[PDB]
Design a protein around this ligand. Structure first.
Ligand SMILES: Nc1ncnc2c1ncn2[C@@H]1O[C@H](CSCC[C@H](N)C(=O)O)[C@@H](O)[C@H]1O
Lengths: 265, 265
């Protein structure tokens, strides 16, 4: 009669909360989705070993089209867990699943976990200064989406930071790198000429948040565009004007050039 | 030797990540602060029992004025952990503490935990649509903070949602309720008269996120301003223009008036 939405956290199998783990262990059935994002620091096998139960993986179609035929029927007479990378319901499509549960007469509860949305606090940038967020999508064929560029423009003009989620082909486990994102943005700039993203733009790259050894780097595009930030996942942030405290953290912790202390504050 | 900043999560001792728990258990000294937020579902004793270590609680003065005199000295020859509610670097000034650690020649690591900043996803509002955030602070003496009103105005004009952290005076055991925040906002509205926050404004309240049964309510200020949302902590949200699915979730899950389903595109 109960469905638990449980977050797995940021990077590996230990990023789930104690609450999430203990509840998952006592569930009769455990399902999981890895299409909204991936858990780069672990494997399905390691998550399964930790929880001590078979993990039934579901595709985007299984969920979006058949959630009520696959998960809810069992949740009706058993305790069922639905694992998701990060924090449940951050992904835009997850919320509606609780309405499906209600419609089916199934109680649902949410067990939170760390999300990249909040983990970016490790960049030293003040969380309250983050504006609207966006996703940088790979252009394909004759389609060249650029809405993320406008998001940066609107946040930056108001002195706000912009969190940029990078494209991920979950199924193929292929990640867009911060370098690729920077090239795209430079390409978009050359087309819109909005003076939003150039070689002189200060950016912050956060890779493998959740790991004990994430890569946190800050600097100008001209210098970071060909830098190796390590294995995925990568997150790109275009900060707005900096509070001196934010700048000092970027210099001392993220290796930012001293120049940001006088150019970006 | 090393210093770990470990988040404890949203509501109780089990909101800590497995990674955080396993590391805390092996530290030589464990310190913590409980003034940045309120964990309403646990006690110091329960946290101490879970980690199996005595926890030395520090006050705001201890941290802000003497972190480098109380904590860092021990981290030079021991493994030390500093625990905090929620995520250690969200809506706190703890990031600066990493700079102090560096200058003291101490390596520091960050272990994330569920944060209210991302847990708001449980309201059904799209996380990427949240703009700049703000804090509603208690007026003191002749000083009456009003910056949060302008943040709402700015976000709303862009169609973005506004997350409002509510004030806390830990040593006095005072936790601002959503009701008190709404009352303060109505007063700022009468002063600035910008039509930003009125009796007809739609708001969302999230109380005790992290618990299995948090209070999630949506409705007009005139109806919710006197409603009992239960024990603190509370967070207040002023949505921008709603997507149809956001409205559906607020109606189905947060008990919002069915009329909001009819969005004015
Ligand atoms: N479980 C919870 N439910 C509702 N609001 C919460 C909450 N935890 C924190 N808050 C809100 O956030 C304020 C503290 S701000 C510090 C937040 C913390 N670092 C985190 O990551 O969550 C509180 O006064 C309250 O308004």
């Amino acid at each position: 009669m109960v469905l638990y939405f449980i977050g797995l956290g940021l990077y590996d199998e230990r990023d789930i909360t104690v609450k999430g783990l203990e509840i998952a262990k006592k569930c009769d059935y455990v399902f999981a989705e890895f299409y909204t994002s991936l858990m780069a620091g672990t494997t399905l096998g390691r998550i399964q070993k930790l929880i001590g139960k078979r993990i039934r993986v579901l595709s985007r179609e299984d969920v979006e089209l058949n959630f009520e035929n696959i998960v809810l029927p069992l949740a009706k007479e058993n305790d069922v867990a639905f694992l998701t990378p990060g924090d449940p319901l951050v992904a835009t499509t997850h919320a509606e699943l609780r309405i499906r549960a209600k419609r089916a007469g199934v109680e649902s509860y949410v067990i939170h976990a760390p999300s990249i949305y909040s983990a970016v606090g490790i960049t030293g940038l003040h969380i309250y200064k983050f504006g609207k967020s966006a996703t940088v999508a790979y252009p394909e064929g004759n389609w060249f989406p650029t809405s993320y560029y406008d998001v940066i423009k609107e946040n930056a003009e108001r002195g706000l930071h912009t969190l940029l989620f990078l494209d991920i082909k979950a199924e193929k486990r292929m990640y867009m790198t911060a370098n690729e994102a920077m090239e795209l943005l430079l390409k978009v700039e050359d087309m819109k000429k909005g003076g939003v993203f150039t070689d002189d733009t200060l950016v912050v790259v956060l890779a493998r948040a959740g790991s004990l050894n994430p890569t946190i780097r800050a600097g100008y595009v001209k210098d970071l565009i060909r830098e190796d930030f390590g294995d995925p996942p990568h997150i790109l942030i275009v900060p707005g004007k900096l509070h001196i405290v934010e700048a000092e953290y970027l210099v001392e912790i993220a290796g930012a050039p001293r120049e940001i202390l006088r150019v970006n504050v």
